[PDB]
Design a binder for this molecule. Sequence first.
Ligand SMILES: *[C@@H]1O[C@H](CO)[C@@H](O[C@@H]2O[C@H](CO)[C@@H](O[C@@H]3O[C@H](CO)[C@@H](O)[C@H](O)[C@@H]3O)[C@H](O)[C@H]2NC(C)=O)[C@H](O)[C@H]1NC(C)=O
Ligand SMILES: *[C@@H]1O[C@H](CO)[C@@H](O[C@@H]2O[C@H](CO)[C@@H](O)[C@H](O)[C@H]2NC(C)=O)[C@H](O)[C@H]1NC(C)=O
Ligand SMILES: *[C@@H]1O[C@H](CO)[C@@H](O[C@@H]2O[C@H](CO)[C@@H](O)[C@H](O)[C@H]2NC(C)=O)[C@H](O)[C@H]1NC(C)=O
Ligand SMILES: *[C@@H]1O[C@H](CO)[C@@H](O[C@@H]2O[C@H](CO)[C@@H](O)[C@H](O)[C@H]2NC(C)=O)[C@H](O)[C@H]1NC(C)=O
Ligand SMILES: *[C@@H]1O[C@H](CO)[C@@H](O[C@@H]2O[C@H](CO)[C@@H](O)[C@H](O)[C@H]2NC(C)=O)[C@H](O)[C@H]1NC(C)=O
Lengths: 75, 75, 75, 75, 493, 493, 49, 49, 49, 122
Amino acid sequence: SVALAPHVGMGLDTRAQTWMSAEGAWRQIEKVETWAFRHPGFTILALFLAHYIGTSLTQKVVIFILLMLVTPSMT
Amino acid sequence: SVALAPHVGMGLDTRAQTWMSAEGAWRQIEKVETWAFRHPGFTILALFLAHYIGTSLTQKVVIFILLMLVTPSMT
Amino acid sequence: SVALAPHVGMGLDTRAQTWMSAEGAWRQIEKVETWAFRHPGFTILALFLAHYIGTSLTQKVVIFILLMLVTPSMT
Amino acid sequence: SVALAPHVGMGLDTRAQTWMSAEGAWRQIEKVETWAFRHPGFTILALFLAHYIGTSLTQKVVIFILLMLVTPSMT
Amino acid sequence: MRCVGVGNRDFVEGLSGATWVDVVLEHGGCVTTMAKNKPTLDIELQKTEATQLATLRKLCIEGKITNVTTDSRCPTQGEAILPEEQDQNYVCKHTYVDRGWGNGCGLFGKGSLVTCAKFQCLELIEGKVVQHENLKYTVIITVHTGDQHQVGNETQGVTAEITPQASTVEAILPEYGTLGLECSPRTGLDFNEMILLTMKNKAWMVHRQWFFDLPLPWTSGATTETPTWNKKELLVTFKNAHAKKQEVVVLGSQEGAMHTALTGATEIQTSGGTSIFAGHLKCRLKMDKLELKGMSYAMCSNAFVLKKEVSETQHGTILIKVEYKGEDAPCKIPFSTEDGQGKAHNGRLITANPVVTKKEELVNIEAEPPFGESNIIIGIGDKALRINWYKKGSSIGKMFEATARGARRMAILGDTAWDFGSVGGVLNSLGKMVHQIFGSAYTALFSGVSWIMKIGIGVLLTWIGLNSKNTSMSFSCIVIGIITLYLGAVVQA
Amino acid sequence: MRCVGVGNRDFVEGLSGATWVDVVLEHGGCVTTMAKNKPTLDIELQKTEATQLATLRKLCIEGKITNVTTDSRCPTQGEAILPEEQDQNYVCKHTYVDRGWGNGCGLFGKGSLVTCAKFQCLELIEGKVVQHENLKYTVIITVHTGDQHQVGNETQGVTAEITPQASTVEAILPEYGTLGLECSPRTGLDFNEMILLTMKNKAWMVHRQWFFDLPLPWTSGATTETPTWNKKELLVTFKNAHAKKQEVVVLGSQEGAMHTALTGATEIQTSGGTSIFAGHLKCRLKMDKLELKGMSYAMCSNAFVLKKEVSETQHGTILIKVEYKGEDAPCKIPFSTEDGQGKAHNGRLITANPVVTKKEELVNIEAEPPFGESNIIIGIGDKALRINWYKKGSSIGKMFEATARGARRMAILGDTAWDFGSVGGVLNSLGKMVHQIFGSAYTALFSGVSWIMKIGIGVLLTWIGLNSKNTSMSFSCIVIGIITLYLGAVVQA
Amino acid sequence: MKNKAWMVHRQWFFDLPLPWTSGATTETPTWNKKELLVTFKNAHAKKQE
Amino acid sequence: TQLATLRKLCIEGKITNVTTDSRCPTQGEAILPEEQDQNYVCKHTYVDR
Amino acid sequence: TQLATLRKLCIEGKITNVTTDSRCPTQGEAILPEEQDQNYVCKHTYVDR
Amino acid sequence: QVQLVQSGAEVKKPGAPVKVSCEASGYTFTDYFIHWVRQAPGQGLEWMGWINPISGGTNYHPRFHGGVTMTRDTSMKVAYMELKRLTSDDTAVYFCARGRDFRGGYSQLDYWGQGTLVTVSS
Ligand SMILES: *[C@@H]1O[C@H](CO)[C@@H](O[C@@H]2O[C@H](CO)[C@@H](O[C@@H]3O[C@H](CO)[C@@H](O)[C@H](O)[C@@H]3O)[C@H](O)[C@H]2NC(C)=O)[C@H](O)[C@H]1NC(C)=O
Ligand SMILES: *[C@@H]1O[C@H](CO)[C@@H](O[C@@H]2O[C@H](CO)[C@@H](O)[C@H](O)[C@H]2NC(C)=O)[C@H](O)[C@H]1NC(C)=O
Ligand SMILES: *[C@@H]1O[C@H](CO)[C@@H](O[C@@H]2O[C@H](CO)[C@@H](O)[C@H](O)[C@H]2NC(C)=O)[C@H](O)[C@H]1NC(C)=O
Ligand SMILES: *[C@@H]1O[C@H](CO)[C@@H](O[C@@H]2O[C@H](CO)[C@@H](O)[C@H](O)[C@H]2NC(C)=O)[C@H](O)[C@H]1NC(C)=O
Ligand SMILES: *[C@@H]1O[C@H](CO)[C@@H](O[C@@H]2O[C@H](CO)[C@@H](O)[C@H](O)[C@H]2NC(C)=O)[C@H](O)[C@H]1NC(C)=O
């Protein structure tokens, strides 16, 4: 839909506050947190996938974080 | 917003077509493709990040795909 | 009496709701948090004191947390 | 309440004696002593915790003092 | 059914060899006790109704400073003395002030002065002890007969009064016999170690030592005129203004600070008697001479019709309200259950004997269906009213909920939580004794630890138990740490 | 418009040569130019308005649907056709449904089905690009004369119109000479790649390529009576139900979803003719012809009186409000800043020539005091009014504040910020060039990255740098990660 | 919605960023979390609209 | 047959009676008497004075 | 001199009216007409029925 | 209707305690004070103490503290008062007044009693 492609990250940055800067700064984080806390089961699956693909701890953490962020956002 | 949390992946699945099944099945993929083709520069950055974190090719591909999916969707 | 010694530690307890349980549960932690926010330099001082006395991370962490809990409360 | 956050330590010292200096100088110490006297067993518990967390004698005594100070004031 | 859907009821089933089961009766929640051939009956403690309170001492929360009189002696001389120092109605303080020629003294130097202020204290707190000799208890017992408008009816019951004098009683239920209550109020609660402090219209139960350790002036309670106070300087502040003079200022009303200092104490009633709530006691229910309502009643031969939508309580027990459409009034209801086209009869029946008393008054039955889908039949033939219920849940989930409830009971109650459903077993008694020893040793250690400090101590203790090589104490430390995490997460009810 | 206390005033001092300074003017905040022997000026870009707008594309947000039709074919017979598919007004999709003897078809199976319905948009959004040479930059230039009423007064100043047709404009200041503005209206915000849509009485400035990527049905924007909506399938939704018939309904008003999708897009005024706020301009100030008012006056021989307490601006600058009680109305205000314990003239005026114009009139004198305690004298002789002030902070504090302010200025402005206050310079130009190259390279990489995703990538880059054995690669990754974290923490102003 | 109903899983309708009510058929409702609709723009940090 | 309304979110919104109170920088937080009114929705911001 | 009072603080209080209204499970929250008033303080709590 | 009625006029010799009473009815006794004001014959009015019948706390005037005692006896809604050792000087009429609990109502008195006049002579 239209809301799925916000006008963020574009090259037009000025002094004045953008439209819904304060509200739109944390909406993605809030929705990710709500989905994660409403589907706690997927946390262990993400941990499992990260652990059997990340050879080092840094790779494990990167893959786990990316899986945690992508799945609610693809919802 | 409201549209950022679609009613998908829930446990209520029946025979009848859901509301906007055909339209809503591919909206995320379409928006990811549009963002990727409108910001081709980020592709090489994602490749760079995947290559300096993925020891094996499978880890490289997983990290690259996850970075490609997450960044437009967090937009 | 003075609020410094509330009747929270006595062994007597029951099924019924205690007087001002909802507030008194988190009153002390709220005071500690607001004191910490008001005076952030003592965080640095406690970090230094814990780092120069705690050989192990357990020792340093316990000293830091105890020292950050005493000063707002012993004031 | 408001009595738990006294106006102590704020940089407004003057030559004139402050309000309730004599009492408020020692109210905290009196509270700690009366709690440590009405609940002797916590002295044993704090000695155990300090012994099993304090490698050196100075660390042991610091942990023991901090434990016997935080708990009366966290009541 | 005075207790159905009370949110804290917990079933007790099974008796001992002498057909007795003991139970602890907490104020919040009741005990519905059922047996093989005895009528299931709701037992809930109501009030403790203490009387003849003696007042020990009277803390006083706001004072009044009157008759500020002072005396200053010249420096290099004895400390100033006022006749009001010896008077017990006055509060005085000694201080040193600077005296020169402008102040009247011949030689310069710090001089001593005193300011004796007559302490009169307006509003006070009365701390009252209750003696076990005059402690009371009211217990309402309800054999939940199949009866119209009885579900969750607090007004219906057969009260039984159990005081330390003649603790053992016998409650005469109107039709099902006489229940016996051989109980001990001595171990119900520590009323010897408690002070009832009455501030204005309210009051509370507080620990005796905590009340005696309060920073507030106190006077022995003898109902005498012009009482003599002690420790008055707790509401009087003397301020030395640049060591030239001092003045006397009363602090003010300690009511708000006293309400904040009472957090964690359980509130009480004062109007219309003491009537302490939030108590608990232990009863031994002697069901020897109880009888069911006409076990020999002829079985009902006509169909039953529903009159209210069947609703499942919090604990999963169905409530069926039926009206009998027959002409043979006194009859026992035929009740049976099925599961998946198999008469498993795994569904129990809490209401022991569903008899229709009058055939005009609709009768309601409480039943416990199986965890699967089950069809409940309340008739004999094909006219039988058939109720199918699907009870969502799992037996493992039921076991976990029961374990959590038992742990919560073992947190509210200490060593005496092992007698809730006890039938005087051997294993249960040994468990009670070992828990008594361990709980005494534990609460001796953690007496006074707060809600958050308990959690912190527990997590520290489990971290210590995880890093100790001596497993003999590593296991012990981890167990104690987990117990303390639970207690910290449960305390402050 | 003589802003003091705006908190973004951005002092600019100095002149390269031939008496001109290059400055960048932004909507939020001013610039304060104070050269030697020139009047000080508090210049800013007041508003930019587009005189005439050309509508380029008009999406629609609401939609009404009428004239639903439907044609079906038997399974093998192929695709169904309505004569109205070729009509651009109607929107429709082919679906497969099951047909049989109950549906009138002679052959069982799944048959094609198409249902075409009319479409018109009740409300529309009307994106309308701005021609880059019909702009009008309105720079308001105060004189900072020290009047009584202009301390923060936003309605006093000199207005100069800056357009690409006539960029260089000499704004004639009253009694202060003619300031020379050589501006660059063509390099501000790149309005060519912006579309400036209007919604309904609420317009916004949107980047060009995003308004072309909105999943809403557009039009040509040709102000035609009957529009031809393209990609109408985005609004109307075709539900095949149970694969037996197809029903079409409108998806509803996209106003809230579009409002959400506009987050991060700077708003804009659309009342009357459009007026673009939130813009920046690069006017270069040529102060050849700026004279002072009172260079020909004498010095005041009488005392001064404070009429309003002195206060400190967010930038450490004090403001002084004095009234001159003397007969020689045209005069000069002697002003010496005596330091603490020493008569060192360490504080400097920000009002070029503090001048009293009338006996009755008050005058506002602005002056930057030293970082320590510092007295300030406003008069001549021993009866001179002496203002005492204690500016707090250290010179390291000002250095850190200026560094952070410049970093922010570079964040919003980019390469153009190198030209802010840039008096000529050859090293400065090289820095601007290298920053241009690196900024283009960075903007290519990090375009379209979120508030949090930028911080995440910055943290990842920093971690990669810390663990990179290659010293050059490690240093590069750490340096780029730190600035990426900064940009992520400052983005979306 | 309005003449178009849907079947939604319970815990999602409780997680919609829209201001709710008790649903008590009251004449004057009390909207909770009204900040989700109205947006507060501080403009140039000089006034709030 | 019969439906019980449990919660009612809202989708459109009209706004009226805009108010505003301000304080000097050091004087602290500004208060409108209408914050305690559940009908009104509002947020605190910091502006330059 | 010329002190400007600000931020009055209540060290005491009084309650006067107290009204209660409760509803059934799965019937939503139980609102009151006095909830919108700016002089009433009140809190939501769940009760077993 | 709410009103306060006294015990009735009393006479006693010097050095004899007297117990002046004040009846209260018609309202919630525990929610208001009894301010027990005094007035000498042809002299200015003089307040001398109030009690809080919800708790029994007594706020005597500094002059009269110890010389007088006041009891609430909330069972019968009767605010008694006693004089420890009545002297010849303390001849007056003792009104009992109703006041509010809070600070604004400390010094406002409505529904006074008629006043028990106590004459002291040998
Ligand atoms: C504490 O201070 C109070 C005053 O704040 C003292 O009250 C005083 O009490 C005496 C008692 O004899 C009063 O003296 C009488 O004065 C009347 C005035 O008409 C006179 O007619 C009598 O013959 C007698 O002399 C005195 O006026 C009164 N002070 C007042 C009302 O301001 C109180 O005695 C003090 N407490 C002590 C000393 O223990
Ligand atoms: C589309 O539908 C409208 C109405 O739904 C049709 O309008 C009809 O127009 C004729 C004359 O033009 C009237 O006699 C009818 O009464 C109208 N129908 C109504 C009012 O229901 C219209 O013909 C349909 N087709 C097109 C191509 O517009
Ligand atoms: C800003 O400047 C204007 C014009 O200089 C001021 O308006 C003047 O106000 C004074 C008294 O307030 C009047 O005597 C003048 O006649 C006004 N001149 C006009 C209206 O042209 C204004 O007061 C200043 N301050 C503000 C806050 O606007
Ligand atoms: C909110 O705004 C409305 C209108 O914007 C105000 O309504 C006014 O009401 C009074 C009498 O109630 C009329 O005399 C006015 O003419 C109305 N104003 C108009 C129509 O603009 C209302 O008072 C404001 N405040 C509240 C609390 O509703
Ligand atoms: C709150 O309680 C007060 C009294 O406690 C109520 O006041 C009533 O006011 C009416 C006239 O407005 C009188 O006729 C009644 O006699 C008063 N009540 C009493 C007990 O005296 C008031 O109505 C209550 N409600 C509100 C919203 O204030």
